[PDB]
Symmetry: C3
Subunit: 106 residues, 3 copies
């Protein structure tokens, strides 16, 4: 999928996690987020279209999604363990990674 | 290892999982598949032999193995947490990821 | 952070794990190691500075940190279930992955 569609999937499911009441909604949303994060790694964002494909900026872009995926992993295991509020608090901390990438590359 | 040997590792251990009897075989097989998936990221497939290692097809290729590794991760936790049958089911669903990369780059 | 600081974070936290008393200390140190491994993957090491950013060496360097991160994952899960000695032994085996990269790119 396009980068913006993957971003839509990340944002829509973050909202689902924040509003969620049970572990099933959270786990389902985090699984969708992981898939969108990895697929976004394949994209070149418009602001880096003037960069080499292995420039430090594109490596930084791609590793940002590895960092997001590992944060999603921690939240997803908490959701699996039934720790709904902890899984939601971990999903809130995802936003630092969202924001940091946007600051550099949106 | 080179790409073909990692692919044999993937194929052989997928068969071990399909024909497994105990959790130890499945856990051991999935850990070997993850290792092989990550090692395969270092390779250049013959159909991309001449392209540049940072071309979008090479990025798509390498991210295919992150996706495979994360799907292996879910199956390995199913094996580690008991559910041998559901791990084998998840291992079987990996073939969709195997096949999607093969359609493009094999 | 730069590569050398991330390397000292890896080494310091491996020391912390070796002298830890309880699982919380081991888990917290492994998460710091995971953060540093991913941040170091963004770096260009001195030995490859005069190579193409898209060189096969640079890809091999970055995949090494994926392999480290996934080994840290298994150690971290041992710590989460409270298996202190088992987590410490797995942390100790990380040194094989540390050294394998150093042999090539130190
Ligand atoms: C880089 C490593 C990023 C991470 C991590 C996240 N996002 Fe992102 N996002 C990124 C870029 C480069 C862009 C620009 C897109 C464009 O082509 O215009 C975006 C965009 C968004 C958007 C707006 C999409 C649109 O409608 O145009 C949203 C809503 C968004 N991103 C959300 C989002 C969330 C919720 C994230 C973490 C959970 C997140 N992004 C991470 C790059 C990166
Ligand atoms: C891309 C991201 C791939 C994923 C995921 C999987 N495979 Fe693959 N495989 C890929 C390529 C480019 C090739 C061709 C290699 C070559 O040198 O021709 C292959 C090949 C195989 C083979 C045949 C190996 C041979 O000796 O010719 C097998 C048996 C194989 N692959 C199995 C396999 C399995 C079981 C996978 C998922 C669990 C899988 N592959 C994923 C690229 C990619
Ligand atoms: C490649 C994939 C590596 C892995 C995995 C690990 N290290 Fe490393 N290390 C690497 C390089 C290229 C370098 C040289 C960096 C430089 O700028 O000089 C290093 C260096 C170190 C150091 C010294 C850092 C310094 O102060 O200059 C330490 C203490 C170190 N590495 C430790 C370490 C540990 C404990 C690792 C595994 C847990 C590990 N490294 C992995 C490349 C790679
Ligand atoms: Cl790359
Ligand atoms: Cl990568
Ligand atoms: Co896990
Ligand atoms: Mg489009
Ligand atoms: Mg759209
Ligand atoms: Mg679209
Ligand atoms: Mg000092
Ligand atoms: Mg010291
Ligand atoms: Mg010191």
């Amino acid at each position: 999928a396009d980068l913006e569609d993957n971003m839509e999937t990340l944002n829509d499911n973050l909202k689902v996690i924040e509003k969620a009441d049970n572990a099933a909604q959270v786990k389902d949303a985090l699984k969708k987020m992981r898939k969108a994060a990895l697929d976004a790694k394949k994209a070149t964002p418009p602001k880096l279209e003037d960069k080499s494909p292995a420039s430090p900026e594109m490596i930084d872009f791609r590793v940002g999604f590895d960092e997001l995926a590992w944060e999603i992993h921690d939240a997803a295991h908490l959701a699996k363990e039934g720790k709904v509020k902890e899984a939601q608090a971990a999903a809130e901390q995802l936003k630092t990674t969202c924001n940091a990438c946007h600051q550099k590359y949106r």
